[PDB]
Motif scaffolding. Structure first.
Motif: not given
Ligand SMILES: NC(=O)c1ccc[n+]([C@@H]2O[C@H](COP(=O)([O-])OP(=O)(O)OC[C@H]3O[C@@H](n4cnc5c(N)ncnc54)[C@H](O)[C@@H]3O)[C@@H](O)[C@H]2O)c1
Ligand SMILES: NC(=O)c1ccc[n+]([C@@H]2O[C@H](COP(=O)([O-])OP(=O)(O)OC[C@H]3O[C@@H](n4cnc5c(N)ncnc54)[C@H](O)[C@@H]3O)[C@@H](O)[C@H]2O)c1
Ligand SMILES: O=c1ccn([C@@H]2O[C@H](COP(=O)(O)OP(=O)(O)O)[C@@H](O)[C@H]2O)c(=O)[nH]1
Ligand SMILES: O=c1ccn([C@@H]2O[C@H](COP(=O)(O)OP(=O)(O)O)[C@@H](O)[C@H]2O)c(=O)[nH]1
Lengths: 335, 339
Positions: A95-97, A99-100, A104, A107, A149, A152, A156
């Motif tokens: 998941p972090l990968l 969302y990263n 990131v 954004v 994720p 998501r 998001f």
């Protein structure tokens, strides 16, 4: 004149071809996580005369300075934001990968865009933002909820784009919810070439077909579908590419969602059988359990896109399979 | 022998929490970028903490500065992390959403990644009642629907979802998600308290600043809600009760996997009620400009307290009167905040 993030990859490569063939200029940034420069070289050659209006760089969107450098050399009426990770299954494990990379990166992109005053955005959303829809087909107005994720990150990001729109009306934003792009350019000269082990159905099937992979593992046989396997809306990547030129015309509206699908639902087994039909090869299957994060049935209502963008998917499954096989046959190991 | 990294620790709620951690035997490292605070808060916490002040270090560090954060993690072993860092104004978020998604989510993800990298997978997260949105349930329970109505609220909802996905990917993680309602007050010593940089966005720090001459009026955001007086209702809790709730959370962490607790009192107070209690405590008049609603404000929001009482064995002990008393104590001697 356009900036194409993720343009070396599957959908962006094809879309860059169309942009060139529509008389557009295009700068690509990609970090070659799941593609290579070889895809864009080919696209340069295939676009012929108009190949000198393509330029491209190895850049990560999370590298703000290097991305700022790009935006300083050239100006863009628009950005097509393809870049990101796209595997439901992977995202649950990592998941972090996701969302990263996705958030990131997005954004960072959105902020650089503001800073240099380019506020027209076409975003690669995904049908995954419908989660397990209680009702199908899936309309642009139906509930958005995700079940993993990856979904998501796309929900998001859509929500972020809405908030930016609300914050500043200089922004013109189109959220394209692609369903399941498959196929290749009909020439067979370019197509899908994912790096590392493949995650999507059809590029895994093409590798099984030429021996680069021993079996397709089918994720689930106990779904409430005609044959127990997942159902999706498969749409020829060349149609999807033409949907981007449509979306660009449309920008000249504030923050709009458009599904890009065919409106038909095809099971996994159906797609395999359609591939065997087009390729003459047999694809060994392993029936396994469901992939964590997968929806059951998901296909598009195509009507908003049909009417608003004056765009239809033309190619059917047999066209998707023929073009895919033509690419795979003539390029069994990719670029 | 228990060591804690506290992000945003120079800020309002972290400040006070850090002191209780020192007082309760914990050690602590604070990282903070001084976006909404100054190092003075933490100087004074060292003094206020006595010899326990000797177990505190603090460092100017942005969470989005990965090299700097990794440095921090390689110099100290952490049994747990309390993540306070972030921007927190609903209204500011509507105006400046990228700033919010950037700071909150890039911030959080980078820290989550570094934590995993160094094998520290015990997190207490600063969430918010704004995840309850404009709710239909009052009181708002940990099982009740979640949905934001503004960018700030979304960062918190999203980050909660991120923590759920991390928990699902990796069962080593222990995460408690604390939904703070509306913390107010200061340490009863009056030697520390809320001191935002620039214009305050929260109610009672704006009110404090009006009381001491620093701002000309309180702008009341809406007098047309469907409430006793038409102003917003919220659950105001003493920052020190809130602080103590973190000691309770840190304890529950040694039991539980990804777990949500509300921290509030369970009473709803209006804006004008809080104004009135502060005038009663301070003896100062607060001029009021009655204006329209703040984009993204809820109407009525207040806490269920049952779960936290049961499971953290935690309950607010301080009332509105104490809250305003300690607020005024802080403000009267420190009218312009820290030096
Ligand atoms: N392929 C699908 O079935 C599908 C369906 C719905 C939505 N989408 C979305 O469409 C977009 C394009 O997907 P695709 O099928 O072309 O996959 P792809 O992986 O071929 O394309 C993504 C490209 O982004 C690049 N990239 C990844 N992270 C990057 C980063 N941080 N900075 C710069 N470049 C980066 C990769 O190198 C790659 O070329 C993605 O955002 C995907 O999530 C795809
Ligand atoms: N005050 C409230 O009513 C309330 C309610 C619910 C939730 N919360 C949450 O509680 C936490 C603490 O809030 P507070 O009232 O102390 O606010 P605060 O502004 O006093 O504290 C936050 C601190 O984070 C720091 N910071 C911000 N971005 C940073 C970054 N990228 N890297 C490092 N430090 C950074 C700021 O400098 C500040 O010191 C926040 O996450 C907030 O969203 C607050
Ligand atoms: O190796 C694979 C990849 C995909 N699928 C199935 O094929 C459909 C489409 O999968 P893909 O990952 O390409 O697309 P998604 O719908 O997940 O974006 C889903 O029902 C998957 O379960 C499968 O059975 N095996
Ligand atoms: O200058 C201000 C700040 C806040 N409020 C109101 O006071 C309550 C508490 O707001 P705050 O921003 O402190 O906290 P929130 O509940 O938004 O996190 C809400 O009803 C706000 O509308 C107000 O009227 N004026």
């Amino acid at each position: 004149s356009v900036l194409v993030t993720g343009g070396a990859g599957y959908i962006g490569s094809h879309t860059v071809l169309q942009l060139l063939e529509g008389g557009y200029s295009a700068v690509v940034v990609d970090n070659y996580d799941n593609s290579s420069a070889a895809s864009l070289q080919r696209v340069k050659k295939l676009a012929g005369e108009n190949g000198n209006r393509l330029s491209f760089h190895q850049v990560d969107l999370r590298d703000r300075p290097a991305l700022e450098k790009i935006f300083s050399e050239t100006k863009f009426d628009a950005v097509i934001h393809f870049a990101g990770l796209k595997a439901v299954g992977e995202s649950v494990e990592k998941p972090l990968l996701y969302y990263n990379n996705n958030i990131v990166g997005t954004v960072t992109l959105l902020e650089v865009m503001a800073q240099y005053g380019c506020k027209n955005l076409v975003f690669s959303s995904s049908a995954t933002v419908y989660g397990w829809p209680k009702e199908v087909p899936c309309t642009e107005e139906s509930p958005i909820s995700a079940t993993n994720p990856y979904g998501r990150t796309k929900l998001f990001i859509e929500e972020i784009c809405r908030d930016v729109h609300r914050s500043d009306s200089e922004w013109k934003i189109i959220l394209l919810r692609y369903f399941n792009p498959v196929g290749a350019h009909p020439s067979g000269y370019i197509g899908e070439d994912p790096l590392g082990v493949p995650n999507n159905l059809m590029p895994y099937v093409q590798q099984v077909a030429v021996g680069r992979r021993p079996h397709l593992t089918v994720f689930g046989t106990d779904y409430k579908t005609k044959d127990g396997t997942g159902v999706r809306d498969y749409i020829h990547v060349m149609d999807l590419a033409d949907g981007h030129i449509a979306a660009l015309r449309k920008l000249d509206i504030s923050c709009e969602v458009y599904n890009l699908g065919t409106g038909n639902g095809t099971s996994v087994l159906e797609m395999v059988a359609a591939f065997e039909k087009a390729s003459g090869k047999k694809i060994p299957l392993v029936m396994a359990g469901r992939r964590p994060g997968d929806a059951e049935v998901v296909y598009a209502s195509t009507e908003k896109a049909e009417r608003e963008l004056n765009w239809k998917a033309k190619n059917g499954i047999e066209e998707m399979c023929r073009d895919l096989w033509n690419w795979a046959s003539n390029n069994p190991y990719g670029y």
